[PDB]
Amino acid sequence: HPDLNKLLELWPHIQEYQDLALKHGINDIFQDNGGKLLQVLLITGLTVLPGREGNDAVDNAGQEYELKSINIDLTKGFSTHHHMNPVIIAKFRQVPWIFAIYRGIAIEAIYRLEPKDLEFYYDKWERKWYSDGHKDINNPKIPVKYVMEHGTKIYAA
Amino acid sequence: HPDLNKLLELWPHIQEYQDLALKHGINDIFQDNGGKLLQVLLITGLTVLPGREGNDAVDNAGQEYELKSINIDLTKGFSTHHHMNPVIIAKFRQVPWIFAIYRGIAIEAIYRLEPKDLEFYYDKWERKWYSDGHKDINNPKIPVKYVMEHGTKIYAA
Predict the structure, then answer these.
(1) Which pairs with CB-CB distance under 8 Å and at least 24 residues apart come from B38-47?
(2) Of A6, A89, A126, B133, most Cβ neighbours within 10 A?
(3) Which residue of B19, B22, B60 to mutate against A (max A Cβ within 10 Å)?
(4) Which CATH number do you get for residue A78?
(5) B60 and A22 in contact by Cβ < 8 A?
(6) A28: domain range?
(7) Contact B58 A49 (CB under 8 A)
(8) Is A56 a catalytic residue?
(9) Annotated catalytic residue A66
């Protein structure tokens, strides 16, 4: 049982990583990309916010952030919000966003966009709601290209 | 100028303390009791949440807390919420509360009440709203005695 052997021996680290993840509010590294999210948290120094919170993270000085991420091996657009409306927008434009770019599970880069750097999309998204008559927008996307063009890279592999 | 001398020489520390306070999201130790609040933050390991947030703090694992405090040299009841209503209550009973007890500016003790430990007051407060017909409650208080009787002391001077 070749591959299997790497299992009872590689498992000490996986567990340690999970221990690390728990100290950071992540109960299961193997669900909802928790293992990738820990990467971002340890690199940036952020603390995750309860899922019920509008934003997803905050630093040691009380500044909050939206946290988006993608695996470029399968997509090129960042998810934003399901049932996206102008109130959601309104809460969004108040905080900086940090974008995590992975290749599979590997963190390749992290970008930070200031509130103004997203002004373009917030405006666009509003039109598609009101000119649209009225009606949510189901998760419009933010192009990795745009993020790279306007953000400041705070991390690279 | 006797006392004045203690000023150009005691000022190196006060400033350092303020430097410490800034690293913790507190812009001015001399306003809104920021100097006392830093005490609590450093003792407990908490991070403050933006004032717009319902709760006031969160730990490294994403658990949030309400943060109340008093100087027993002048009062014996903990403030809760102005324009207190049942929705406010509803958000409140979901998180633990940590109470800071000071003598003047000195931190004397800190207590933590679990959500259930406040069940008594939440229920009482509801009656005074509905039996009251309907109408907010302007900041009812929580007795230090009660806090000491039901909380677990996480710190003492």
Answers:
(1) B39/B100, B39/B107, B40/B67, B40/B69, B40/B98, B40/B100, B40/B107, B40/B110, B43/B107, B43/B110, B43/B155, B44/B98, B44/B110, B44/B154, B44/B155, B46/B98, B47/A47, B47/A58, B47/A59, B47/A60, B47/A62
(2) A89
(3) B60
(4) 3.40.210.10
(5) no
(6) 1-157
(7) yes
(8) yes
(9) yes
